[PDB]
Symmetry: D2
Subunit: 253 residues, 4 copies
């Protein structure tokens, strides 16, 4: 039978990478509003700090930490800081990442970078928290991937190849971590109208993207926040190694 | 921000196939307990009625109809009964259907039958309830597919191909019905310990299926009911054409 | 090292369903030209018969047989006739099939039909030849599926769902038949400019379809004939359970 | 109509990574024997040179270069040597690369390295030879990926994710290079019995891997060389962005 408390994160401690803005910001707020203590990580400290007061204005407890996910040194620091501020780590939502469409002849530096963001940082950070989660008898890791991980188009070599790596790592990491009773899942956002896109997108552009979405509307960060909550909640206790695409049933071009 | 009402089905009217036992019974009870009025359908009216009684005891509203999904006549009869008893239809949970390991040399009757159970039935009923969902302004159709739809093995020709047909039906159907604000999704459950297997299973046999499952415990009907709720709740309003697997990150032989 | 005879069908006997025209016609000719005796099956006898003289004009030996693949009675007849005319059956290429885009509210008859063509006939015919192939110690089954089996778009419910069933049957049948030392593979044609499309397609239409194909050109039946030869040849002796998409790297819309 | 010349590489110039042994060596010999001039590259010049000698003995033209694919400098040096010795480049067979089972707690050095071996190397070399292929009017790049790219298991985080990255690189890269008439494909080989394993394997161990393979025999290097030939031969001129698995229809543990 239905049980609302299974849909909440009461007493949980979560790290949310790149949560100073966009989808990441919504996950942080939505998680704190469901009962979990949160460490809001982001390179843009001022942004991270805004999210924190914003959570307190709601009564949740958040802490800010600047952290370049691409710096191994900052990742271990993020981890030590999180275990000190919250006392433990139950949830890790690896949101930060990116890269973008690029020509085939981008310098290798551009190529290597997508991996730092989408693959290596994600993997190093899990290695850091995994021991903590295993100490407490379990935990949940959630990464935000992308639909590029499953589509193919021009100028997507690095971004698409990296996101694919991350999605497949999820499927395998689910096995290594499963022993430590840690679930690992991912979510592939469609065209999320994060405030950034929201500012540029022309009503003509919108129609062009929504041209192939059955549920004719652009996504909102919340859509991704709802999916994350479910996947990180106890209601999803036997769900591991999955990638949930949240994109209205189609693809935005 | 976290909104608990988005995770409830207040005033939603759901039809649920094969709800006398196992997975369907639990989705019926979880749904009804989350605020929706439900029609419990089943080839076993005794079972359906018991489930209805039990739902009412918990203070939920529910109605029972003995329906054999392999009958076109009986499928229309199910739709009329729901229109008649609930007044409208917002959610269809196509749970019944089946088939299992069959010799390559099985009689064609047996082969086609797996299609009756998982494909033709599911599609027709969708045709029946679609027109009713659109007049309410939207809806959610959800199927209980299978991991056989994604796996490969011996003695699975009928069973696995039909579940594969059903799973790709979800993806395509999401396009057609997307213009009528209807979302279509499915769930691929692993080895779920339903009251039947619960007594056919022996602790020995168990350590074998679980041999390749990261989250080392067999599934409970609640796990599936939990994902169906989310997938049919307004919180997953931009999730369509997806097939979520709940198997603890592995495959139970 | 390279060995041309491994790329030929010398001494092989092949059944080619729906070979009176299109892709099917090319497979027949290309196979006979590589050394195999062929039974050219098709509902349009005159077409089947043309292909046969055409093969003889090249020195290959073909035999015609009218056969509605959707009639169980005609399938067993096709089989008995093939084993009588050729002496044995080494290769089965299940080309005939079809169905097409259809609205969600097509009558059920339309839905059931796609399955007769794409799934049931294919499965019944394999059941019929499998015993013959097993007698000779091996064989090869090849089905022509479609890209609909992997894409999702509006008005594709039946066609797409059926082709998906067929592709997944390939993956599983590979296990049942593997014991009988029979390989089973499929090929998913992209937009093949079969003489039919070739007659209607406007130079403007062409551009529209080729809009998303990296190798900017429409396919030719031969392209599919080359793939089939490889997959049915000894060079592909450890290749089973595969679906090869031949579509220039993209999709034609 | 069957055309044997389409299945040959006469006057084609191919570069082949890790061609001193196993799979690469055989693709080198099969290619050279099918009419193309080949550059045999390898971190082991002794091995490369022996393979070159052996090729010449069979009357084919070949050249050897000791190249360590993990070096950007050495990759450019390989491209110059091929341009210098063969005059042009029409085919690139990226065979080397690797990595294997690694503990979740592996050092990041080991993790990144799997990316050096299967991702970064493969991409860069593609960048190097692309410009040369387009000036000849076309080309074919082909990678030796892995079944780990599609599977899930314990102790495969690095190995499997990098092969997944490489496999999705094929799909996307096919778009970019498609405008320059360059086709990109890959092959996922199963358990191939190469001269090394050939002596490390014990008849006991063999009956175990083969336990779930329909075509019950381990793969031979020829099987892979056979598919690479076809995939690089003009006969597969409309096949791009594909990843063919050669594993006898199953998975060898
Ligand atoms: N918005 C979309 O439409 C969309 C679609 C598909 C996938 N995604 C994925 O979702 C994730 C988040 O995307 P978003 O759209 O919210 O992005 P965004 O760039 O708007 O926000 C990223 C947040 O992370 C911060 N950040 C950037 N680099 C960082 C670093 N190196 N270390 C720590 N923090 C850093 C930014 O300041 C920002 O607050 C990414 O992994 C992205 O690949 C987004
Ligand atoms: N339980 C598992 O481990 C598992 C795993 C994978 C897929 N599934 C899927 O879940 C669904 C239910 O499986 P389950 O094991 O919970 O089922 P079950 O055998 O318990 O059947 C559930 C209910 O359906 C009823 N029913 C059977 N045939 C019917 C018909 N023809 N018309 C109407 N009602 C009918 C049964 O009497 C029962 O009350 C199926 O779609 C099955 O493929 C279950
Ligand atoms: N042409 C394309 O672009 C394309 C694309 C994707 C998939 N396909 C698939 O390829 C296969 C063959 O397609 P095609 O394009 O050559 O088709 P087609 O309709 O041009 O030719 C089919 C041939 O089979 C015959 N046929 C029709 N029904 C038959 C039946 N019931 N029994 C026996 N023979 C019958 C027809 O007379 C004809 O000679 C089909 O399974 C189709 O789904 C084709
Ligand atoms: N053999 C199998 O069962 C199998 C299965 C799956 C994938 N593969 C793939 O096939 C490819 C070759 O595998 P294999 O077992 O045949 O390989 P292998 O270990 O025999 O290596 C082949 C050649 O590559 C050379 N080489 C190694 N590192 C190199 C480097 N850094 N730079 C240049 N040359 C180098 C080796 O010395 C050897 O001569 C790899 O991509 C591997 O992932 C093989």
């Amino acid at each position: 039978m239905f049980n609302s408390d299974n849909l909440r994160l009461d007493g949980k401690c979560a790290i949310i990478t790149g949560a100073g803005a966009g989808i990441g910001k919504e996950i942080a707020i939505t998680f704190a509003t469901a009962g979990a203590s949160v460490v809001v990580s982001d390179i843009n400290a001022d942004a991270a700090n805004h999210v924190v007061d914003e959570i307190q204005q709601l009564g949740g407890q958040a802490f800010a930490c600047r952290c370049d996910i691409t710096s191994e040194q900052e990742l271990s620091a993020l981890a030590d800081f999180a275990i000190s501020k919250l006392g433990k780590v139950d949830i890790l939502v690896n949101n930060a990442g990116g890269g973008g469409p690029k020509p085939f002849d981008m310098p290798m530096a551009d190529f290597r970078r997508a991996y730092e963001l989408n693959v290596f940082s994600f993997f190093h950070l899990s290695q850091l928290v995994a021991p903590e989660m295993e100490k407490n008898g379990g935990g949940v890791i959630l990464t935000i991937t992308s639909m590029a991980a499953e589509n193919k188009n021009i100028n997507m070599t690095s971004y698409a190849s990296s996101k694919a790596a991350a999605s497949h790592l999820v499927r395998n990491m689910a096995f290594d971590l499963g022993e430590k009773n840690i679930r690992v899942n991912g979510i592939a956002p469609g065209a999320i109208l994060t405030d950034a896109l929201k500012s540029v997108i022309t009503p003509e552009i919108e129609q062009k993207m929504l041209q192939h979405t059955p549920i004719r509307r652009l996504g909102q960060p919340q859509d991704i926040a709802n999916a994350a909550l479910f996947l990180c909640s106890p209601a999803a206790s036997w769900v591991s190694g999955q990638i949930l695409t949240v994109s209205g049933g189609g693809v935005q071009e």
